[PDB]
Design an enzyme around this catalytic site. Structure first.
Site, PDB file in Angstrom:
ATOM      1  N   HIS A  41       0.765  -1.237   0.000  1.00 19.70           N
ATOM      2  CA  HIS A  41       0.000   0.000   0.000  1.00 19.70           C
ATOM      3  C   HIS A  41       0.817   1.322   0.000  1.00 19.70           C
ATOM      4  O   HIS A  41       0.239   2.414  -0.010  1.00 19.70           O
ATOM      5  CB  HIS A  41      -1.088  -0.020   1.078  1.00 19.70           C
ATOM      6  N   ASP A  96      -0.517  -7.722   1.680  1.00 28.83           N
ATOM      7  CA  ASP A  96       0.031  -6.374   1.689  1.00 28.83           C
ATOM      8  C   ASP A  96       1.566  -6.339   1.725  1.00 28.83           C
ATOM      9  O   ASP A  96       2.154  -5.750   2.636  1.00 28.83           O
ATOM     10  CB  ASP A  96      -0.534  -5.618   2.874  1.00 28.83           C
ATOM     11  N   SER A 188       3.824   1.895   8.308  1.00 26.96           N
ATOM     12  CA  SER A 188       3.597   0.894   7.277  1.00 26.96           C
ATOM     13  C   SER A 188       4.871   0.281   6.736  1.00 26.96           C
ATOM     14  O   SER A 188       5.862   0.975   6.585  1.00 26.96           O
ATOM     15  CB  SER A 188       2.862   1.534   6.106  1.00 26.96           C
ATOM     16  N   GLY A 189       4.806  -1.012   6.404  1.00 24.73           N
ATOM     17  CA  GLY A 189       5.955  -1.720   5.842  1.00 24.73           C
ATOM     18  C   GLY A 189       7.010  -2.067   6.864  1.00 24.73           C
ATOM     19  O   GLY A 189       7.837  -2.919   6.613  1.00 24.73           O
TER      20      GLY A 189
END
Ligand SMILES: *[C@@H]1O[C@H](CO)[C@@H](O[C@@H]2O[C@H](CO)[C@@H](O)[C@H](O)[C@H]2NC(C)=O)[C@H](O)[C@H]1NC(C)=O
Ligand SMILES: *[C@@H]1O[C@H](CO)[C@@H](O[C@@H]2O[C@H](CO)[C@@H](O)[C@H](O)[C@H]2NC(C)=O)[C@H](O)[C@H]1NC(C)=O
Ligand SMILES: *[C@@H]1O[C@H](CO)[C@@H](O[C@@H]2O[C@H](CO)[C@@H](O)[C@H](O)[C@H]2NC(C)=O)[C@H](O)[C@H]1NC(C)=O
Ligand SMILES: *[C@@H]1O[C@H](CO)[C@@H](O[C@@H]2O[C@H](CO)[C@@H](O)[C@H](O)[C@H]2NC(C)=O)[C@H](O)[C@H]1NC(C)=O
Lengths: 236, 236, 236, 236
Positions: A41, A96, A188-189
């Site tokens: 994302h 994801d 994120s990530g």
């Protein structure tokens, strides 16, 4: 991250900072000299990454800057969900993941070191560490210093109970039921390490972050081991 | 809206409150018994509208609830921008318009009435009105009562100077250079009334809302008349 | 100050209003009949003080006007930083303290009284008060009446996380993580009262004032006692 | 600049953008392949410059980045005034010049071109152009696009009448008596061109900018011709 603390200087050598030009947008994990792992994302046109960072806004001479030659988002992530202003009940955010191939190999040093893929399956009750330069306020203010938080791995049931989105097998559930400690916008990530092993990466969570009783969703890395390796080996 | 006032009761029968499930997400304009206009960026899977609404937290019997059968976003709006995590410099948000076909036509009472599209082109200096239940704080907090505000139509160069994104002919620049008055988050799609005439819709603006020397963007409706009429006439 | 209230009348006889010509520029603390403390960064050529002031725009007969004979800025404050057009990352603003020798000693009335320096070291969690005629808006506008506000003493890591500049032992971190309450421009040099005790002085903070998740810096007075006493005793 | 307009694309090829790392701090004028001219008051530890810019925040491929090997501030500028929080009446800000020697020569193209030192003396009543990326609001908001303004050269008397600082022979006075048009924060060092010739550079002005009846102060370049040339020739 919210409710965390200043990670120790260079304690998380695999922690990556993903940028869209001069702007930090996500976290990442260094797996190999030419391969970094992040969330599918974190969608932008061009990618740049910083390795060995501790201070996001100060230039450290022992850090490493690198450009990304190509990105390989997992073919299973439903990209169409991104155009949506509101998440439809039952939306599935599985898969994801995304791989980024650095144009120029990175120099493994004391400051920069990859981390190995997991071999065992995540066991609930486990104590896990999450890290990043994501917001420190539940609703946005980023920090200079990399932040670290400790959380608990909980059964998927816990998460599926409180979310309207689908919680699937390729996801993990973790957080503090007491709330107050959680990852947040732009974490994120980032990596999620349990009992010293990389178990998954930050994906999505409650709005606001650290909401009491609502854990966060991370990718179950063990389920993707094949696809990752296949992609690394098949891509020069 | 920021720095406005509670719109007088039932003064704006054309103001549409676009919901998604139980929550308001955008605004819009009633153009016909079975046609509502809003912003292309108010993208969700299912659409619901409320008409003749004044309060956001109160059952109003004069108010009419409906549903949308088909939605038609303008063929020009680059939906791809919506998936990007950050707006690249030069990003063109032109044609931010979308029509909503109603399931069951709206009954025209003294509390629910349409407004005509303009034929008069806009000239700077003009006084315009905008309304909606967008945040009443510059960064969020939705109001119970519908808000109204008065702003000045400025030449496009005022916006271009400060915006990294492209400011085009299909756009309008409006606000107050002094700051303090502006539209905010979730006011999108609502109407812009210049001299008792509908000249455009709330597209986007700065964050914080009401930033001094940084006005906001609105769609130059006059440029979309042909299209607007065709889409209603040809289709539904 | 931002988000405070009008200090009760004559409640803070120690609050000093440091002027330059006809205009107020800083705050300070009355420590003796002929000694006022303030921020080293309140650097001007000539100094004037007003004591027992409540209003900034009103002749008060209880109020005492004076003049400063000699000023002694702490030998540690890097004055060079003051000439720089921008603060480099890592800039150390430690020792932001300066003593002002009065021309003619202050008469101790019920409206003009000193305050003792602390012996008790500060502990987080504590409730502190700060006051002054600094901007009452986050970005400016000075008030007529002296403002007061209540904030929480936080551990230094809260400030370090978000500040690019060095946060040291001679500094204190205070404010409200939620934002909205803080000291603002021209409050510098004023006092910080924790549990009815003077613990430090307003050094600097974020801009905008009261930024959520970004508290403000104050001098850790306890660390300057030896110096403070020597400078009064040895000299004037 | 306040009350100006968007300069034409590449119309001011000599216009320079002075940075302290990644932050724009001042304007400048390109005189020779290795020499740029700016204000002595743009004081920072290291300098970087951008040539051929039109958009301050967007990367233009036809622009040129360069590092500065050494700075030569005029020996007459009173640096001590910079540490002062308030300007003392009668303060002299004459000699506000500084030369910057680029480490690597610049490539004269269509986009980048130096401008010649003046030969004639400035004549009052003259129509002059000022340019920069300084604030567009009288009190701060910078623009993306380079701004241009037209002003009138006025007798020094006009300025000396309204300022508390000394207005000397090595200064120039210019602006609009009607106010509203003026240079502003961070326009410093920028060029002032009258009747097509470089006459001086931006130094200081009223707070707020464009104050009616208070012109702005620029350096009288003709008076410094010798010193500049001497410095260029004597310094490799
Ligand atoms: C619509 O927006 C997308 C997102 O910015 C633009 O796509 C990029 O286009 C450039 C070339 O113009 C490519 O190098 C990028 O890789 C593209 N990104 C993606 C995600 O495809 C697209 O150009 C825009 N369309 C228009 C007409 O402006
Ligand atoms: C990806 O997400 C979109 C949005 O939820 C899904 O598209 C919906 O698909 C259903 C049928 O399964 C339709 O009835 C909806 O109207 C669709 N909505 C939109 C906006 O297209 C899509 O099916 C999801 N999964 C895949 C594999 O595309
Ligand atoms: C530079 O500016 C400073 C500040 O105005 C000047 O210093 C003052 O000099 C006078 C005597 O001429 C003293 O009485 C003041 O007390 C000084 N003030 C300070 C803060 O030092 C200085 O003289 C100016 N010019 C030069 C050449 O230094
Ligand atoms: C006081 O502040 C000044 C301004 O930042 C510092 O001076 C710089 O020091 C570095 C080396 O440490 C030099 O390379 C720069 O050129 C200096 N700039 C100037 C204008 O002299 C100084 O180091 C600071 N002092 C302390 C103890 O931190």
């Amino acid at each position: 991250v919210v409710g965390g603390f200043n990670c120790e200087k260079n304690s998380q050598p695999w922690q990556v900072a993903v940028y869209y030009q001069k702007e930090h947008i996500c976290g990442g994990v260094l797996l190999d000299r030419n391969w970094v792992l992040t969330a599918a994302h974190c969608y932008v046109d061009q990618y740049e990454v910083w390795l060995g960072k501790n201070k996001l806004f100060q230039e450290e001479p022992s850090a490493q800057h690198r450009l990304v030659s190509k990105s390989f988002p997992h073919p299973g992530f439903n990209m169409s969900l991104l155009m949506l202003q509101t998440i439809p009940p039952g939306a599935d955010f599985s898969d994801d993941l995304m791989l980024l191939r650095l144009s120029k190999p990175a120099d493994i040093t004391d400051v920069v070191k990859p981390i190995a893929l997991p071999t065992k399956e995540p066991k609930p009750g486990s104590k896990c560490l999450a890290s990043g330069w994501g917001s420190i306020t539940p609703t946005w203010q980023k920090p200079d210093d990399l932040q670290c938080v400790f959380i608990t791995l909980l059964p998927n049931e816990n998460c599926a109970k409180v979310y309207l989105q689908k919680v699937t097998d390729v996801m993990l559930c973790a957080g503090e039921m007491g709330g107050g400690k959680d990852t947040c916008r732009d974490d994120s990530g980032g990596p999620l390490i349990c009992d010293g092993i990389l178990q998954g990466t930050t994906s999505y969570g409650p709005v606001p972050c650290g909401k009491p009783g609502v854990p966060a969703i991370y990718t179950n890395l063990i389920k993707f081991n094949s696809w990752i390796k296949d992609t690394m080996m098949k891509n020069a």
